[PDB]
């Protein structure tokens, strides 16, 4: 892998590049491939540079210096425009489409919310998994809201503080681990009034131990 050279040689290399460019430009101008650089002039330099020639036709001279200013500003603006490709192309396809590198292992977080009736929270949560491209499953039951989110590690890190610190009845991640392959499909909701209907749907993807852990944690909290 590469190494990160320090700021001293950063400045040194930048100075080498700029001096290289300046000397190459000066050699080309000495050859004459481009005209010698006309003195850059502003309003404050208007009478310093061209004043003697600016007395005869002042408005022409100020028009010329403003034209030079406009040409410089236009060169800058269209240089930015030529360099401006990530603004739209990357925006969401090359600057926000990452997927958290979930190729060899999918981080899975199983949370148990005691109260999740609010559709707002559900909507936001699902919405939060759509932009992060994280898979998930949510089973609703009597005082047991199991949510198994399987996605990338960055999406699992961003969703850990979303359900614990950004959304409010308590939510606790009962199991945080990785898997060899993805088990759950898209983020869909399904109502299960009985534990058998949730356990049969969890047995379709082999996630019956996630519901069995939540059913054991919901009974251990009622003792003490």
């Amino acid at each position: 892998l590469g190494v990160y050279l320090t700021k001293k040689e950063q400045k040194k290399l930048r100075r080498q590049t700029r001096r290289e460019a300046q000397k190459e430009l000066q050699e080309k101008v000495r050859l004459g491939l481009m005209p010698p650089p006309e003195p850059k002039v502003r309003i404050s330099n208007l009478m310093r540079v061209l004043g003697t020639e600016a007395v005869q036709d002042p408005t022409k001279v100020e028009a010329h210096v403003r034209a030079q200013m406009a040409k410089r500003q236009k060169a800058h603006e269209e240089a930015n425009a030529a360099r401006k490709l990530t603004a739209e192309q990357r925006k969401v396809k090359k600057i926000k489409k990452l997927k958290e590198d979930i190729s060899q292992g999918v981080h899975i977080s199983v949370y148990r919310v005691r109260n999740l009736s609010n559709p707002a929270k559900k909507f936001k949560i699902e919405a939060n998994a759509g932009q992060l491209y994280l898979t998930g499953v949510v089973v609703l039951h009597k005082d047991v809201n199991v949510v198994v989110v399987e996605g990338g590690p960055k999406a699992q890190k961003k969703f850990k503080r979303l359900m614990l610190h950004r959304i409010k009845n308590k939510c606790v991640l009962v199991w945080e681990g990785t898997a060899k392959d993805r088990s759950f499909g898209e983020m869909k909701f399904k109502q299960c009034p009985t534990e058998n209907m949730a356990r049969e749907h969890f047995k379709k993807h082999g996630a019956e131990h996630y519901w069995d852990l939540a059913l054991s944690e919901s009974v251990l909290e009622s003792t003490d």
């Binding site: 290289e20 190459e24 050699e27 080309k28 050859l31 491939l33």
Partner: protein, 61 residues
């Protein structure tokens, strides 16, 4: 009135050669020189100018 000038060729070869990778290793320097056939050094030709000569030589090939 004819052109009769290849000095622009000299500038273009200089600017191409300035953007030509040269190993910072004298060993590589001399290995590449033996690959092309140039001597290890000239009388009183130190390492910096050895690398510079290597750069000037691979500017052509």
């Amino acid at each position: 009135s004819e052109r009769q000038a290849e000095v622009l060729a000299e500038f273009e070869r200089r600017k191409r050669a300035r953007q030509i990778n040269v190993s910072t290793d004298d060993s590589e320097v001399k290995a590449c020189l033996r690959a092309l056939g140039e001597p290890i050094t000239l009388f009183g030709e130190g390492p910096a100018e050895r690398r510079e000569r290597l750069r000037n030589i691979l500017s052509v090939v």
